[PDB]
Amino acid sequence: SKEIKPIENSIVKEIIVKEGESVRKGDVLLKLTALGAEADTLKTQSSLLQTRLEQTRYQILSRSIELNKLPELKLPDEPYFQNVSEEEVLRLTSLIKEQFSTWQNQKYQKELNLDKKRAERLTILARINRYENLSRVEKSRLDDFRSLLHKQAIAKHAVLEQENKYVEAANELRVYKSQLEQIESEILSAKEEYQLVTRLFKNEILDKLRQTTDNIELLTLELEKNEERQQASVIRAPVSGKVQQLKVHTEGGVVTTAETLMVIVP
Ligand SMILES: [Zn+2]
Numbered sequence: 001s002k003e004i005k006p007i008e009n010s011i012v013k014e015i016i017v018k019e020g021e022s023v024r025k026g027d028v029l030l031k032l033t034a035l036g037a038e039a040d041t042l043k044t045q046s047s048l049l050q051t052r053l054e055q056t057r058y059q060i061l062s063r064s065i066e067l068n069k070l071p072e073l074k075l076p077d078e079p080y081f082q083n084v085s086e087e088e089v090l091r092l093t094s095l096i097k098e099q100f101s102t103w104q105n106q107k108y109q110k111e112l113n114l115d116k117k118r119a120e121r122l123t124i125l126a127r128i129n130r131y132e133n134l135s136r137v138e139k140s141r142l143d144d145f146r147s148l149l150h151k152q153a154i155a156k157h158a159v160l161e162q163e164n165k166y167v168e169a170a171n172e173l174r175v176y177k178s179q180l181e182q183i184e185s186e187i188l189s190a191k192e193e194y195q196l197v198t199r200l201f202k203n204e205i206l207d208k209l210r211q212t213t214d215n216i217e218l219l220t221l222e223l224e225k226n227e228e229r230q231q232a233s234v235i236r237a238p239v240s241g242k243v244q245q246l247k248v249h250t251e252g253g254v255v256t257t258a259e260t261l262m263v264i265v266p
Contacts (some may be wrong), residue, residue: 001266002238006255010034012248013232019246023237023264030235030248030261044223045083049143051219052080053092055212060096062205065198070100103201110194124180131173131185138166241265 010032017029056075064070073093075081142162148154246262248255255261 001241002264003260004029004235004238004262004264005260006030006032006235006257007233008032008034009254009256010233012251012253013246013257015251017246019243021243024240025237027237029232029237029243030249031065031232032235032255033232034229035254037226041223041226041230044219044226048216048219048223049080049083050088051212051215053084053088055209055216057092057096058205058209058212061099062189062202062209063166064096064100065202065205070096073097093255104257106197107194110190110197114187114190117183121180121183121187124176124183128173128176128180131169131176135166135169135173138162138169142166169194235261237264239264239266 003045010162011034013033015030017023023029033243053075057158060071073096075089075092084244142159142165145154145162149159154229243266244263244265247261248261
């Protein structure tokens with residue numbers, strides 16, 4: 001007495017009723033899935049898996065920053081990590097290893113420069129000490145010399161050459177002191193270069209981790225829509241009675257909203 005049509009163009013997921021079967025109002029007759037829903041959901045799920053792999057990547061790298069060494073490169077076994085291919089895991093671990101290696105090498109280069117500057121500073125300090133001691137010695141010998149001038153116990157020539165020696169010592173000292181100031185400045189700059197590497201690495205990891213979080217959020221919303229559309233529609237008997245004129249026996253075939261799948265009499 002009443003015709004049964006699908007609310008939307010779909011695929012016959014399950015045929016529960018047979019021809020001539022008696023059903024009550026509310027009994028399930030047919031379950032349908034909307035066309036193209038499973039493929040869409042599959043796509044969204046794939047994207048989710050990828051984004052989560054990336055999330056794992058940047059989490060591991062952040063941890064490696066905190067440890068200055070890589071943690072164990074394994075996926076946690078959570079339900080979103082149930083359909084991961086060997087290729088995806090390999091790609092993940094390779095990416096992690098390569099980024100960590102590059103970071104470490106950059107650090108080591110800047111640290112190398114810094115250490116070179118430190119060694120140079122040590123050398124400069126040694127020279128400064130040397131010529132300060134030399135300067136003072138020549139100055140004292142010269143002072144002893146030049147008032148022997150005023151008691152005419154020494155030649156002017158000896159005085160001139162001692163003054164020459166002292167002057168050279170003092171000039172060398174001044175030069176190396178200036179060099180000390182400059183190298184100290186360069187050491188400061190080198191420290192800032194060394195620190196900048198890890199600073200930027202840490203920042204970039206935080207940024208990417210945030211991005212993956214946002215992406216997981218949006219993809220989750222899209223997945224929610226997909227799951228809402230994909231969930232099987234159930235057709236329940238609007239009245240109790242007999243199933244007649246059933247024109248559906250193939251699971252997996254297409255039915256349209258204009259098609260009468262069966263009638264329930266009366
Ligand atoms: Zn001379």
